[PDB]
Structures are given as structure tokens and as C-alpha cells.
């Protein structure tokens, strides 16, 4: 019982084929790997400060290995900023950011 | 892989005593006596083991008194409890009681213990008894180092404390002999342990070779000079060098940043200078004795300088 | 076709003994590139008794390697003469980035800083159904590194040129650092080729070979792991990866003939390595290989075994840019592999000692601005 | 400038060696150097 | 110029063995060695009268010794206290 | 051992009884305390701060320790007191043979001045190091004991030489090699590769004090081109043509240089700390 | 928190051929210091790398074994001045240098030819001064070793003087301990001092110490790849008599020191044959009568 809820292969690929009013944050992460735990807790200090005006998931890359390489993905620790409405586009992250650069990117874009 | 080592004896005197040798023969000539003295510097006095601490007794005016039904006083029950050895490996406090009833003896079968903590006597003598009556005994266990003296007497009434040892390793030997090889110096070192049965010689050797080397770890850590075990501890404090404190700022920008010539730059790197403080530190007049420079060269670190900062703290005219 | 500008000659003025090493590629902080499942020698008697102490993972996944600024900082800290060419952005992450390199002596003249383009943020378009991203928006600083930005002077004094095939990725920073990888062949040095295959190139082997063939011939040394080797090869691993004894089909010693393929005219000597476990050397006279440790104290984030590869690449190259006419002799490269299988266990053990351990159930720990850790006292406990 | 000594030192040597120390030197160098002698002599014994 | 011979220096200097060299070379200019005790008697009861908490770092007496051996051209640390750095 | 000539080891329960007034005192003055009565609780709570505050009081205040019985002239002398656990006053062991140390546990009495006059008579008379010579004709009361002149015996004694060093004669058929400095025979010394007896030559900078007694030199090595070697007993003088004094070498063991090394050292390092 | 740091408090450089450093381990807890202490004393005095110069061929320049018209020095003097020279390379096996000057009055200082590999710490330093017009000309050989040279590859020679120079690269090393303890803790700091020649700096010193440290201590955790009369004394204590034996066999095995049955049963065959006037008719009848029960 977290923030971040696990998702699957067809459920993650429907929140941006409809439509929201608050940002979604697409995390890749991996079991195995030790910078990604480390991410978790600092996703999870984001998410519980935008309890309603953010929304954070996570999708594995074992199980989704398929989904992972159409989503031009490079590393284990890696996010994608994507925002409600159209045209606005996509921000990869590549790698262990602070949570200051997570605010600086969820408010100011 | 020409370094070979192997159990050469293995032996069980006892449940409570374990012997064991080994072999280390390809060694060479100054290697083996430090590696000797180390190892059982870390054999005797850096291993660690659980004993009970604590024991609690149902209702006994002092430790020194006696008890119907029992031969022992309080004392002697005390000190057999001292000698019952435990096998742990987390740290902490757990608790353990016996509560033997009727006529007999009361040995280690009898206490009942975390599903952490084991007992390898099984065989131990407690205390004995004569008479139907109920024995009750409360428990402590903890895992330290060393040995503990019984100084504190506070957060509990009505319980006293035993000096408990942690030492599982009884005695430790070693011995040095030649391998004869002619021009080469090489040596043959062995190694005896004794082990109170806790752990066996060879996961005692493990476990002083892992303590030696994270005793010898920490001097290739970097030089301290903010909260450590975050991999973020170089970004919050950069953002907070240059913003709580003056002149600190000159310290974080370093030679490389400033657009500098190779040449120069790799002569101020020969000549431990590697920060801007530094290069402000030295007068102008330092800058010549260091070999491969010119005249023109200061000229044009002046101008960059210049156009870099305001001014200079050291590298005025005088 | 490629340009050179030596103007002064101050080769032997200012050099120093310890020959400089360019490592190219991108500056990041924490990514792993891929991992694969792998085997471990460890005992598995002492394991089965601190099951409730020991951290010992259910599946074992190890990744190839770090990040080019991470085998920098290694080979700065063994004593070697390192620079770092890339680019970064000019926000706090890249100047806090630039700090870590030249707090621990690596050299960052090289490393060029734009004001326009952030660090670690690329621009990315829907694109058509399927969840196809499109990363044309916009370059990371660490893709789009100019042809012209390459600073010619360091390639010059370089002795030895290494770089990954995460560079290699973009189409923009490929021909960059081919021209740049070009550049220090002809001045005069070898080239390290460090092939950690990142996620989208274990689709297939064929591709993943054509990919990479740009490479692997401008490069005289190449460290490749025992999983990439099977993957560009045709050989299908055929270990248990999850058994509790070593049975020798694991650490498998490939004959020379499976080599043979591969190998090409201006290569000199091929690093297989299967961790700090077993080490393997194919030259073109003999081959040997070097047991290893790979038994230390492994917590979470440590456990993807990734400071093991990049001290065993700061030895490797530390070993090899000394003595450079000892290349292809038997027992230095022994002694090197040696050498880089100890700083590998110790870089190993460093990260397992400065990073601690996660919190377990009961956590009432300070809790860090970015994270949460404790010690390795503190995780000892009973609940 | 001490004299050098080839020959093994008793007791009436050093008493000696104190009473010529303490003439040229003083009570202040004496006090230092009997005290390195005696560490001197503990770690050797 | 013996390379191996700070040990003995800082185990001087943080000892106390300076006040032992700086009594004997002050007892070199003065014939009694009672007058001497009692012109610095008197100086340090002057000195404590005048600012009773402010007798200098810990006494007067050391204050005292090493005015007197800071006004020879002999550098002295006040009243002959230095704290050690190093201790957590 | 460890103890100075001028500090002795006093126990924390004689320091505390002795120093009460001066840390209940110190404890009034600054803070934490506003009564006598709490100033007493606290010193009987056994807090850190109350030990901390007694070690900055005896950090400089002189103690007197005197035998009970007072035989000599020297029984009674000042120390500067040390805080150290235990229940036995811890002198050196120079100052307690100079005492009449005995078997027995001898019992010393500790007294502490009060008035400032007290103090710099204590402080500047009744040290240890001012008074040194017995008053009966001038010899030094404070001798290396027992062990110290046992250990100089066997750094100065050297080894055998004759018959007991070699079997046969020497007629019939190298040392160790020339060392430029003591540094580098104690080095090799710490290194074990000379023993503490192996004899060995050192390079003597030409300082003109060759110790020796009055015997000619055993053999003179005159050559054609004009250097002549003089052999003595003990050293080697190389001497040229023209009354040149080239190379002086020593041929002696490692406890006899690091006698005179410490020595040397000893009395340099207090010159340097002087200034 | 209660992380293990080291600090350097005390860097002098007292010359070009001496340098010295102060170093604090302050978390220890007690018993730990006096064994790091010793420990890394140990390997800073044995385990460092050194190079310096082994072999001197001499025959080059003119000299007659004992006196050189050209140099001022003795050859023995040279070879002294030879050996002091300190050295800075990671040399692997051997390697030749030579020196060469050509003048009429010159002092012979850091004119050695040496590879890339190798270089001069000490500039300064003089092989041989008031060298009258001759040519000079000298082989040297260098090695990099731990201890020291016990034996030399080639043992004959044909002018080549082997100097027994020890490496050495730190010249003294001292450990002190402080303990800062307030109650039941015990606290205590290291206080590392060490002395090299130059050819390292004193903060290198302790990092190939440790990593020699961790390289000898890491064998230990290697591991290689797998593939009536029925009582206790009732037979123990019986003795060879009281089983019927022939007369022979008895005072044969009494001769070899055989007296119980458990004296027997250890003794094969083969060393049962090694008895004298001990034949195979007498092993089939002895473990007939130990069967025969
Ligand atoms: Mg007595």
C-alpha cells in the first residue's frame, strides 16, 4: 500500500491515448538494479508532497522488454515528464537526478 | 592463482571446542609474519559472539542468598549461565526463560530461545534440583565485543547483571618454515585455531580476513575535510559552498574552467596548482622560477585574470 | 581525411611521465547501461547459515559497467593522468558534475559547457500509435557534442583513446566520435574499445554485430563480458544461473577457434571478462585466463556489480598505458589482470561501504534531502 | 659533540656521564636526556 | 638537522617541559633564587587584584612567566595553555 | 613508565576529594550550578562536566607528595597531577628509586597549596628537575635504575671478537657493507637483516674525535701512488699524500650509534624547542 | 555518522630527497589502532615497490680496478654515489642506462640516459666531480623490487661491479595512539607519521600499503571451482600374549615394539614384512588368529 502503483503492458499505454489534467511520471526501473532503488525513494518523497496534482507509476523492464525499446529507452533509471494536454511534448531523463531538477521540471514545464 | 590454501586437520575434542590447521605455502619471504601477526591480532579480539547479559529470578532477596530445592546458591546458578554458549548474528536484545518443573537437572535443553538464536552444548549443567518445585529463570542474550562489565544497573528492578565474555575464539598459533628454493626467499606459514564451537575455524578465519580488510578500507576513501551515505553529497553541498560562506567561491572554480593555453595549463599542474585560489596564492614572482616559462605567458594569464575577476588577491604589483 | 593542427611542438617541454588517457562519452550519474544474468563464485555454505544477515539477491543480474566520468574517477584514483572530453549543460547538475571530476583530480579542459541545452533532459514526440517515441525534439548536451568542439591539443597528448558504444547511439554524436576515436589513431595511440551494449541492441545479434562494426576495427584493445561475447556469437548459454554449487560449466574458457571470427588485422589483445571471478585474455599467440574473489559485501545499490568492472578497466588501462611495449607478453598481462581484479574488489567493497544499506521495516532514520540509508550495524537488527 | 663510547657503560659510567652532563649542559638538557636514556633502555631490555 | 625529530618537539611543547627551560633560564640573570619568587609573587597579586576573573587564561603565575618571556623575544603561548585539535 | 619527570598519575576519587572547594568553586562561577547544595549533588551525580571542569582546574595547579617516612632530605617533592584511573599513585620510576622505593606499598601523603606565595615556591623550587645533586658532596640523586643501566649493558656491551666469533684461523681466508649513515644501520637493523651484534663499518664525517686509546695502528697499507690505509683496532683512516684526511670509517655495532644518535637528537630537539 | 575518515593534518617537503606526513583515523574503536598501526608500519617498511641501480659497468671507462687517472673519486667512491641515486619508475624485470659526458673539467650529475619509464628525482646529486679530460663512460642496470636483491641472475661477471643497494622507498615509519573515552566508550585515534625518499609522495604511501594489505589478506576468502570379554578394554587391552601365537611370531613382534592389538592392527603388511625373520606364512596365521575369534 504506496503511492506508486505497479502497472502492466496494456493498461500503462491508455493514459495517453485519453486524457488528464495532471502530469504523469513514467518510471522504468528494474529489480535488480541498485540506482533505481534508490530513485524509488525519492519519486515517492515527490509523489507524497503532489498527493492530487501529480500522478507517478512504474513499469518493470523484465517483464516489458518489448514496451521499453519502442520507448527509446537507454538505462535502467529513467523517467518520462509527458504532460496532460497534446502538442506539449515528452522529457526523458537519463540517470540519477536530484529532486530539485524533478520540481524545476514538473512546475515550470 | 599460485597461492593455495587448504584445512590441513580438522578435529572435534568436544561440543565445545573445535580444532582446526591450515596452510599457506607459496608465501613469500616478508609477507608471512605480517600476515601471521594480523591474523591473530584479528583472531583474539576482533570477532564477535552472543552471550547472556541479563537474568531475572522469580522473587530472591540478593544473589548471595539461597534457594530451597536447589543445591546451588543464586551465585553458582549465575555463574553456570555464564558459561552457555549461543550462536547469533543479529544485533540486539532478545529475551529467553527456562521453566523447568520437578525433580532433576536443569541443563541448556531447557531454554527455549528466539528462532535467531541457537545453543551448541545442549549439554551444559544450570543448576540442579531436589525437590517438586517450579524453576523460573528470565533471559537476556546480546551480541557485542569483547567483554562486559556490569556497571549500568538502571531500566529494570529486580535483575542482575552477569559479566558476559564474547570471545569465541579460545587460543590462536602460527608457524613459519622454508620452502627451499634456492635464489628466491619463499615460506610456508600454518595457522591453528580453537573455537569455543560457536563457529568453525574456517568461517573464524572468513570472518577476521573480511574484519582486517574493513579495517584497512577506509584509508582509500577520499580525504574529508553534507550527510554521508547519499550518493547526492557532492550537489547540495557545491549549491551551499558558494552561498553560505565568502571566498570560498575562488576554491571551487579550478584552472581548467578559465580558457588557459595547454602549455600553461599543464606547467601550473606540474607545479601542484590546481585551483584559482592557489594560482592567486603565489605572487607574480613565483611564477618564474618554475622551468619551461616566459615572460609573456604571465602577461597573458594578467589579462584573463582580469577579465575573469575584478582583482587579485596576492598577484599585485609590489 | 581528417585534420590536424600542431602548431608548437611542447611534446617533451611539460608532458610528464604518466602518459595522458582521453576518455570520451557522456557524464552521468548513476546508469547502468543493461544487465544480463550471470554466476557468481561464492560459498554457499557460509551463505546458508547468515541467510538473515547476508544480502544475497534471488536472481543475479550483472551489468556491464558504469559511465565513462566513473572509469575516469577510478583511474584518477589509482594515480593515473585522466580528461574527460564531453559535453555538459551549464545548469547545477552539470557544473555539480564538473566538480566531482576535478575534486578527484580527472581533467576537465576538455569538457565543454553549453548554456542553451540542459544536462540530463532529451525531448521526446508521441509519434504514431504503438507508443513509438520520437527523441528528434531535442539533443541531450551529452549527444550533441559538435565535430568542431573536439579539443585537438588534448587528442594530441593522449597516449590511449577510450570510449563506449553509448556515444555511438545518436546519429549526431556517432560521427563524432568516430572522427574523434579517427583522430587519435592517426596522431598516434591505442584505443580502447569498451563495448557495453545498452538496452535497444540485445534485440538481435546480427544487428547488434552490424551496429557495432564501425567500430571494433579502428581499436587495438577491446574488453567484451562473457554474455555479449555469447550474444554477438551464435553460442546460447546453456548454466542453471540460479544452482547453489559451482559445477565448472560456468567460467567457461572458449576455445580459440570461437574467437577466430571476430578478430581482425590491427588487433592486438581481447579482454573476455565474467567479473572479478574468472578473467580471460585471447592474444594472437596464446591466451590464458585469471581466477578471481567476486565474494564481497554486497548491499542494495551495489548489488548490479558495476564499480567491479569499472576498477577492473581503470587497472586494465592503468597497467597497459605504463608499459605499452608489454602488451602482448604473457605474464604482464597475468599481472595485469591480476591487478585489475584487486581494484576491482575494492572498488567494490568502497560502494558497499559509502553507500549503505536501505532502511528496513522499522525506519525512524533521518531522512536525507534525496534519500534514506543506514549502516551496516543498523541493518543487523531483529525487527 | 658527546663523546662516542666503544666500551660497555656500569652504573659508575653513567653516574659519570650525568655528573660531566649536568656541569655542561645544565639541569634542563640533563632532565630530557636521562629520560630518552631510560626509554632507550626499557625498550632494549 | 636530524629528519626524525618533530615526535620529541610537539611532545615538548604540548607536554609542559617549556615552563621547566623558561624558570631555569630566567633564574640565570638573578643572584637569590627567594627574591626571584618573591618579585613574582608580588607581580601576580598585583596582576589578580586588578581583574579577579581576568587573571589571564587559566592562572596568573603562568600569565605572569610568559609576559615576562614574551618581553625577551621568546614567543610563548599565553599563560602556557594550548587545547588540543584533536579531540572528539 | 610513561609518566615526565615532572607529571605523576593521581586517582580520580584522591583528585576529587582534594580538588572539591576549586570545581565547586569553578561550577558557581560560570554556571550550571546556583547553590552549594546543587553544585554537591551534581559532583556526587558523577556528570562528565564535572569531571571536565576538575581536569581544567588541575590542568596547572602543582601537588605535593611526601613519603611518610622522611629519611632523606629529597622525601618531599612537587608534581603537576595527572587525572588517571585506578586506586595507586603513578610516579616515574626515576623519582621513586631516588624516594627509597620499597616491596611493600609505600604510602605517600598528597597535600595542595592554596596561597599564590605556596604555588610559585612549589612551581619554581621544589621541582624535580632544579634539584638533582645530593647535598652531600654533589652526585647525581636521580641514576638510571635496574633496568635502564641493564638494558645501556647490553647496548654498549657489544659481542665476542676472538676465538668464540670464528673457529679457525683467519689467516687461511666481507663485513656488512659500508653505511653512509646511522639512519640506514638502523634501518636494516628494523629491517632484520644485521643483527643487533653483527659488526659493521660506518662512514664517519671526518669530525676529528676519533675515540680510541693509545696503540698504534696494526697495519699501514702504503702504496705506490702516495694513499696510505691505517688500520687500527676500531676504525680506518684513508689519508692521501699531501696530509689529507679522505675517509674516516667506524667499525662498531647498531646499539653504540643508536645510543649516540638518541642522544644527539635528544639534545638537539630540546635546543630546537627552546626557541 | 560514525564513518571511519582519514585526514592529512601535518606536509612538510624539508628537501628534494625528503618529505614527511601526519595522518588521523579518528572512529576507532579500542584494540583496533595498535593493530592497523602495526600493520601498516609492516607494509609501508616491506611492501612498496623501489628502484634503483644494481649492476655498474665500469669497464668502459678507463680505470685500472683501483684508481681512475680521469675521476678525482675511487671507484669505490663512485659506487657509493652511485647507489644514493633515487629513482621513480614502474619498471617490469630490467632495464640498461648509460651515462656518457665529454669535457675537459665537469662534475658528472643527472647525465643519465634513461627510457620514458624512469626518471630522476634528484637533480642535484654528483656521480663523480673534478673529472680530468677522459672518456667517461658507464652501463648501469636497474630493477624493481620489494625487499631487496638476495641473489643476482648472473652470477659470473666480466666487468660488471653489483652494488648492494636496498630499495627502501619509505625511510621511517611510527604509529601513537590517544584514547578519548567518557564513560563506558573508548575512543581511540591513529596517528600515522611517514618518512619517504622523495620518489613518493607520503600520501601515496598509504594507499599502496592498504591495497597491498587488502592483496595479501584477500587469499583467504578465495575459492576454486568444484567439480564374556566384550568391553572397551575387554579387546583394547588385550595383549599379544594372552591371543596363542607360534613362539616366532611372538618374539618377533615383541622385538618390534608390538604389544597390544591396537599396535598390530595399525602396522600393515608391508612394514609387518620390514620385520626381521618375519615371513607370508606368518601374516596368513596372525590374521587367521585375529579372525579366529
Ligand atoms: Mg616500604
Not at chain 2, 212 to 220: V, Y
Not at chain 5, 39 to 67: C, F, M, P, T, W
Not at chain 6, 56 to 72: D, F, Y
Not at chain 6, 142 to 168: A, E, F, K, W
Request: neutral net charge; contains cysteine; glycine residues 6%.
Amino acid at each position: 500500500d504506496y503511492l506508486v502503483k505497479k502497472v502492466s503492458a496494456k493498461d500503462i499505454q491508455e493514459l495517453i491515448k485519453g486524457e488528464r489534467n495532471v502530469p504523469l511520471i513514467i518510471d522504468f526501473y528494474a529489480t535488480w538494479c541498485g540506482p533505481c532503488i534508490l530513485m524509488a525513494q525519492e519519486l515517492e518523497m515527490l509523489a507524497v508532497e503532489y498527493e492530487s496534482n501529480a500522478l507517478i507509476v512504474k513499469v518493470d523492464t523484465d517483464d516489458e522488454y518489448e514496451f521499453a525499446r519502442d520507448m527509446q529507452v537507454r538505462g535502467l533509471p529513467t523517467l518520462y515528464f509527458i504532460s496532460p494536454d497534446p502538442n506539449k511534448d515528452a522529457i526523458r531523463t537519463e540517470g540519477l537526478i536530484p529532486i530539485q531538477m524533478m520540481r524545476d521540471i514538473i512546475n515550470n514545464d | 592463482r599460485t597461492l593455495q590454501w587448504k584445512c590441513v586437520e580438522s578435529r572435534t575434542d568436544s561440543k565445545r571446542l573445535y580444532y582446526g590447521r591450515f596452510i599457506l605455502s607459496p608465501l613469500m619471504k616478508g609477507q608471512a609474519d605480517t600476515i601471521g601477526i594480523a591474523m591473530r591480532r584479528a583472531l583474539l579480539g576482533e570477532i564477535e559472539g552472543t552471550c547472556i547479559t541479563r537474568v531475572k529470578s522469580e522473587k530472591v532477596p540478593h544473589e548471595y542468598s539461597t534457594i530451597t530445592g536447589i543445591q546451588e546458591s543464586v551465585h553458582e546458578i549465575l555463574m553456570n549461565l555464564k558459561e552457555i554458549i549461543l550462536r547469533s548474528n543479529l544485533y540486539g536484545t532478545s529475551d529467553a526463560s527456562i521453566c523447568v518443573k520437578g525433580p532433576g537437572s536443569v541443563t541448556a535443553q531447557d531454554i527455549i530461545l528466539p528462532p535467531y538464536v541457537e545453543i551448541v552444548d545442549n549439554t551444559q549443567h544450570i543448576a540442579s534440583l531436589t525437590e517438586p518445585i517450579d524453576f523460573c529463570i528470565g533471559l537476556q542474550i546480546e551480541r557485542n565485543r569483547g567483554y562486559l562489565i556490569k556497571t549500568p544497573h538502571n531500566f529494570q528492578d529486580g535483575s542482575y547483571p552477569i559479566d558476559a565474555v564474547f570471545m569465541p575464539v579460545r587460543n590462536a598459533n602460527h608457524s613459519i618454515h622454508s620452502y627451499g628454493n634456492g635464489n628466491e626467499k619463499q615460506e610456508i606459514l600454518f595457522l591453528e585455531i580453537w573455537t569455543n564451537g560457536s563457529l568453525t575455524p574456517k568461517e573464524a578465519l572468513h570472518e577476521a580476513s573480511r574484519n582486517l580488510i574493513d579495517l584497512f578500507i577506509p584509508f582509500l576513501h577520499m580525504e574529508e575535510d553534507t550527510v554521508p551515505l547519499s550518493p547526492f553529497t557532492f550537489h547540495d553541498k557545491l549549491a551551499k559552498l558558494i552561498k553560505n560562506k565568502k571566498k570560498i567561491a575562488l576554491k571551487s572554480i579550478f584552472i581548467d574552467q578559465s580558457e588557459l593555453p595547454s602549455r600553461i595549463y599543464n606547467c601550473l599542474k606540474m607545479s601542484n596548482i590546481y585551483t584559482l585560489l592557489d594560482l592567486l596564492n603565489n605572487s607574480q614572482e613565483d611564477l618564474m622560477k618554475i622551468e619551461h616559462f616566459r615572460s609573456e605567458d604571465v602577461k597573458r594569464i594578467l589579462g584573463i585574470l582580469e577579465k575573469y575577476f575584478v582583482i587579485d588577491l596576492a598577484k599585485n604589483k609590489f | 581525411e581528417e585534420l590536424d593542427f600542431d602548431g608548437g611542438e611542447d611534446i617533451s617541454f611539460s608532458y610528464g611521465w604518466p602518459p595522458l588517457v582521453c576518455c570520451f562519452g557522456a557524464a552521468q550519474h548513476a546508469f547502468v547501461p543493461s544487465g544480463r544474468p550471470s554466476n557468481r563464485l561464492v560459498d554457499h555454505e557460509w551463505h546458508e547459515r547468515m541467510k538473515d544477515a547476508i544480502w544475497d539477491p534471488e536472481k543475479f543480474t550483472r551489468a556491464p559497467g558504469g559511465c565513462s566520468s566513473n572509469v575516469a574517477v577510478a583511474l584518477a584514483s589509482l594515480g593515473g593522468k585522466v580528461a574527460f572530453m564531453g559535453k555538459l549543460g551549464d545548469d547545477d547538475f552539470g557544473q555539480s558534475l564538473v566538480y566531482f571530476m576535478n575534486i578527484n583530480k580527472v581533467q576537465t579542459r576538455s569538457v565543454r559547457l553549453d548554456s542553451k541545452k540542459a544536462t540530463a533532459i532529451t525531448h521526446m514526440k508521441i509519434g504514431k500509435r504503438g507508443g513509438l517515441r520520437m527523441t528528434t525534439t531535442k539533443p541531450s548536451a551529452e549527444d550533441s557534442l559538435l565535430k568542431s568542439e573536439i579539443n585537438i591539443d588534448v587528442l594530441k597528448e593522449a597516449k590511449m583513446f577510450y570510449f563506449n558504444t553509448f556515444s555511438m547511439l545518436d546519429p549526431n554524436m556517432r560521427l563524432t566520435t568516430l572522427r574523434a576515436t579517427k583522430i587519435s589513431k592517426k596522431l598516434g595511440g591505442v584505443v580502447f574499445y569498451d563495448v557495453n551494449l545498452p538496452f535497444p541492441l540485445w534485440e538481435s545479434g546480427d544487428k547488434a554485430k552490424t551496429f557495432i562494426q564501425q567500430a571494433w576495427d579502428l581499436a587495438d584493445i577491446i574488453e567484451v563480458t562473457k554474455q555479449e561475447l555469447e550474444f554477438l556469437c551464435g553460442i546460447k548459454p546453456s548454466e542453471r544461473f540460479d544452482t547453489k554449487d559451482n559445477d565448472r560449466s560456468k567460467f567457461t574458457h572458449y576455445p580459440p577457434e570461437v574467437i577466430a571470427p571476430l578478430w581482425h588485422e590491427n588487433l592486438k589483445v581481447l579482454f573476455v571478462t565474467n567479473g572479478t571471478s574468472k578473467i580471460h585474455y585471447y592474444t594472437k599467440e596464446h591466451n590464458s585466463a585469471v581466477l578471481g574473489l567476486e565474494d564481497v559485501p554486497l548491499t542494495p545499490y551495489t548489488s548490479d556489480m558495476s564499480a567491479s568492472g569499472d576498477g577492473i578497466i581503470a587497472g586494465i588501462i592503468r597497467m597497459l598505458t605504463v608499459q605499452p611495449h608489454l602488451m602482448t607478453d604473457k605474464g604482464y598481462l597475468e599481472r595485469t589482470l591480476k591487478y585489475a581484479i584487486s581494484c576491482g574488489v575494492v572498488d567494490q567493497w568502497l560502494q558497499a561501504r559509502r553507500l549503505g544499506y536501505p532502511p528496513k521495516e522499522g525506519m525512524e532514520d533521518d531522512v536525507v534531502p534525496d534519500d534514506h540509508g543506514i549502516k551496516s550495524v543498523t541493518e543487523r537488527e531483529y525487527r | 659533540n658527546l663523546v662516542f663510547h666503544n666500551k660497555a657503560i656500569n652504573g659508575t659510567a653513567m653516574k659519570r656521564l650525568i655528573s660531566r652532563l649536568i656541569d655542561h649542559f645544565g639541569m634542563a638538557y640533563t632532565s630530557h636526556i636521562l629520560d630518552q636514556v631510560k626509554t632507550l633502555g626499557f625498550q632494549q631490555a | 638537522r636530524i629528519p626524525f625529530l618533530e615526535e620529541q618537539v610537539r611532545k615538548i611543547r604540548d607536554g609542559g617541559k617549556l615552563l621547566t627551560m623558561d624558570i631555569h633560564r630566567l633564574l640565570l640573570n638573578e643572584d637569590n633564587r627567594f627574591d626571584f619568587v618573591n618579585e613574582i609573587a608580588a607581580e601576580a597579586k598585583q596582576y589578580v587584584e586588578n581583574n579577579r576573573d581576568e587573571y589571564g587564561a587559566k592562572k596568573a603565575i603562568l600569565h605572569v612567566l610568559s609576559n615576562r618571556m614574551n618581553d625577551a623575544g621568546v614567543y610563548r603561548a599565553e599563560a602556557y595553555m594550548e587545547s588540543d585539535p584533536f579531540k572528539p | 613508565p610513561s609518566l615526565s619527570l615532572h607529571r605523576c598519575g593521581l586517582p580520580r576519587e584522591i583528585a576529587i576529594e582534594l580538588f572539591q572547594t576549586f570545581v565547586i568553586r569553578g561550577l558557581i562561577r560560570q554556571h550550571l550550578a546556583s547553590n552549594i547544595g546543587v553544585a554537591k549533588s551534581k559532583i556526587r551525580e558523577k556528570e562528565p562536566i564535572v569531571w571536565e571542569i576538575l581536569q581544567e582546574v588541575m590542568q596547572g595547579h602543582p601537588v605535593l607528595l611526601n613519603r611518610a617516612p622522611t629519611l632523606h632530605r629529597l622525601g618531599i617533592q612537587a608534581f603537576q597531577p595527572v587525572l588517571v584511573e585506578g586506586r595507586a599513585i603513578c610516579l616515574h620510576p626515576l623519582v621513586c628509586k631516588g624516594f627509597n622505593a620499597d616491596f611493600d606499598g609505600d604510602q605517600m601523603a598528597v597535600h595542595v597549596p592554596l596561597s599564590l606565595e605556596a604555588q610559585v615556591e612549589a612551581r619554581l623550587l621544589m621541582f624535580s628537575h632544579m634539584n638533582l645533586l645530593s647535598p652531600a658532596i654533589g652526585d647525581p640523586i636521580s641514576v638510571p635504575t635496574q633496568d635502564m643501566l641493564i638494558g645501556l649493558y647490553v647496548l654498549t656491551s657489544g659481542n665476542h671478537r676472538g676465538i668464540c666469533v670464528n673457529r679457525y684461523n683467519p689467516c687461511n681466508r666481507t663485513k656488512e657493507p659500508f653505511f653512509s649513515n646511522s639512519y640506514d644501520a638502523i634501518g636494516a637493523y628494523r629491517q632484520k637483516r644485521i643483527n643487533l651484534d653483527s659488526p659493521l663499518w660506518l662512514r664517519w664525517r671526518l669530525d676529528q674525535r676519533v675515540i680510541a686509546s693509545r696503540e698504534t695502528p696494526i697495519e699501514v697499507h702504503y702504496e705506490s701512488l702516495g694513499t696510505f690505509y691505517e688500520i687500527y683496532g676500531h676504525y680506518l683512516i684513508v689519508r692521501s699524500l699531501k696530509k689529507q684526511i679522505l675517509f674516516i670509517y667506524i667499525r662498531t655495532t647498531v646499539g653504540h650509534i643508536a645510543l649516540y644518535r638518541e642522544i644527539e637528537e635528544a639534545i638537539q630537539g630540546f635546543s630546537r624547542a627552546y626557541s
